[PDB]
Design a protein around this ligand. Structure first.
Ligand SMILES: Nc1nc2c(ncn2[C@@H]2O[C@H](COP(=O)(O)OP(=O)(O)OP(=O)(O)O)[C@@H](O)[C@H]2O)c(=O)[nH]1
Ligand SMILES: Nc1nc2c(ncn2[C@@H]2O[C@H](COP(=O)(O)OP(=O)(O)OP(=O)(O)O)[C@@H](O)[C@H]2O)c(=O)[nH]1
Ligand SMILES: [Mg+2]
Ligand SMILES: [Mg+2]
Lengths: 333, 333
């Protein structure tokens, strides 16, 4: 068959003060009248049954999860004891499928307007997997040189639009992101993945036993076991843990509009710089993304800043620095 | 006998959002648990009887002034129809004195902690007033090269510390201010004045007839005459109007600590730059001023900015632009 793994187990620290530990980004209606998570399940449901859809989560957001995705079975929600980033998150999820069953790993913080373009891309990814095995990533074609994107360099072509990962890069300085685009053959690391359960779990033991050995004989739905094991599991991402080191990483071309709700800069790029109005007063200040809350905000003498007013607090952030909003959360919480 | 003329009819537009047209800066408690106006009044009352003190205001602030200043007779509050800046309020205030009455003109928004030393200086001015006549001012020894002040180029010395004003200057470049302070022959222009009532009026007649003729026979307390009188009178400070033009401005040295509460930087200059606490979260942000309102403020990647949060609005201001807060009030109101 096929199984979709929805990763909804992070904090969404970079979206303070809208996102909190009590209410992470996954449940916010940033776009449309639907949450980030809801949009992801709907896109998935287009072609798949709910029975086939699995959500790896922190124990706290279980009840939240049941609300947003009522059609999801109670059993298909997995509750983690601790968050240790996307690497372990993938391991517990992949064990639930059949050994040879293809598992589509999806972040819940992606905005992909064209769901059919999406599914064509997942179909092609499905056939590539059958044809070459390995671990697939979905590389978005850059439309700009955005910092705060991981990148994928293209290796030897296998078939049209499917290549080996020549080089897996991260964290571009402003010029280093201009370098990337120029080339013609650097794609944005989407954060989506496709693999067959068995091959993936096999590469984890090779690449990251720290992960494997403590989770190989652990049942995912045993909370008290998962707890006991996660105490020895490292907090590393899928990418640093596996997708860099592994010698069978492939990349498929995702030729569609795609955005990652990573940091506040991403929301700006969607709806654009805020224009002056009764509630947002501007004086010698260009390229501002303000978000108001029943009282006006004036920015004077500042350009390329994010301003977000909330009952949780106010963020005032230079756009370049948007990735550091973690620090705020870390200190505050 | 000597009279005091307190200018408290302005809007405090550069203190938005703390200062509003309903509650301007003169009624705010920027330092200590008293308002600017109250401090100004208590300073005066040390050596002076309330009957000898006059406060010039806008009409809307009349009831509020009474509450702040219960010792001041109702009749010693002169009510204005509309703002014409200080030069007009200086005229209708001074007219109330006798011709040979030395009037001491005081902004309601200075911080001068050492009242003993202030008064010492006004006595030295008073004696200078008898020997030399002319208009006096009070020039503060510049402690740093301020961009925000006008300076008093010392002319001929009449007597130690007391000089003919050679010239009145304005907002220097960091460079040009650096020249004035390095030379030792330039004092900051406090905005304080001392003059005999007849002589001042005589100067307005010579430097600003516009004002003179329209208010020469007006009764200041007659609201409607004044109203018709102000319809015909230019909005202009006493500095541009009279002091810059006239040929008998003298200046006395103020060695005391003095500060003008002219914009938000002035507050920072007193309180100092704000440090991290439970409510001010700083992340790669230096030299910052933050006024919280019972919810956390995080500043990320911005140096030299003012952030003020209130029920009325939020200001985010690059320091060097602090003067432009007027333009916020203009748009918003
Ligand atoms: N199960 C699990 N999921 C995670 C973990 N970390 C992130 N995720 C999920 O994987 C996706 C990638 O999330 P990110 O873009 O990194 O956002 P985030 O991790 O929630 O929040 P920050 O990275 O702190 O800003 C999101 O849908 C998360 O919910 C984790 O440690 N465990
Ligand atoms: N009576 C009267 N007083 C004034 C007028 N304009 C300013 N003042 C006062 O004289 C002093 C001058 O201080 P300013 O720095 O100009 O303060 P402000 O004009 O109230 O506030 P800004 O609009 O920011 O300039 C303050 O005490 C003012 O209240 C006026 O038109 N009439
Ligand atoms: Mg993360
Ligand atoms: Mg003014």
């Amino acid at each position: 068959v096929m199984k979709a793994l929805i990763l909804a187990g992070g904090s969404g620290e970079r979206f303070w003060p809208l996102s909190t530990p009590e209410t992470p980004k996954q449940f916010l209606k940033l776009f449309g009248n639907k949450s980030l998570m809801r949009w992801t399940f709907e896109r998935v449901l287009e072609e798949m049954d709910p029975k086939d859809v699995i959500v790896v989560t922190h124990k706290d957001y279980v009840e939240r999860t049941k609300k947003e995705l009522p059609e999801l079975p109670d059993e298909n929600i997995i509750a983690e004891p601790m968050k240790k980033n996307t690497a372990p998150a993938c391991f517990i999820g992949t064990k639930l499928a059949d050994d040879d069953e293809p598992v589509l790993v999806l972040p819940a913080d992606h905005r992909i307007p064209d769901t059919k373009k999406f599914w064509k891309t997942v179909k092609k990814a499905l056939d590539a997997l059958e044809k070459y095995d390995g671990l697939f990533t979905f590389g978005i074609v850059p439309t700009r040189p955005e910092t705060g994107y991981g990148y994928i360099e293209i290796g030897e072509e296998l078939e049209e639009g499917v290549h080996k990962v020549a080089q897996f890069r991260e964290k571009p300085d402003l010029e280093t992101a201009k370098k990337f685009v120029e080339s013609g053959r650097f794609l944005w690391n989407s954060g989506m993945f496709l693999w067959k359960a068995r091959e993936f779990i096999e590469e984890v033991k090779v690449c990251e036993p720290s992960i494997y050995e403590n989770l190989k004989d652990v049942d995912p739905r045993n909370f008290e076991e998962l707890k006991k094991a996660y105490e020895k599991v490292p907090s590393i991402s899928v990418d640093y843990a596996v997708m860099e080191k592994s010698k069978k990483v492939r990349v498929v071309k995702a030729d569609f509009e795609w955005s990652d709700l990573g940091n506040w800069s991403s929301v700006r790029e969607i709806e654009g710089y805020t224009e002056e109005s009764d509630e947002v007063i501007l004086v010698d200040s260009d390229r501002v993304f303000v978000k108001t809350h029943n009282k006006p905000i004036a920015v004077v003498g500042l350009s390329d800043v994010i301003v977000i007013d909330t009952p949780n607090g106010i963020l005032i952030c230079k756009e370049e620095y948007a990735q550091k909003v973690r620090e705020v959360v870390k200190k505050l919480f």
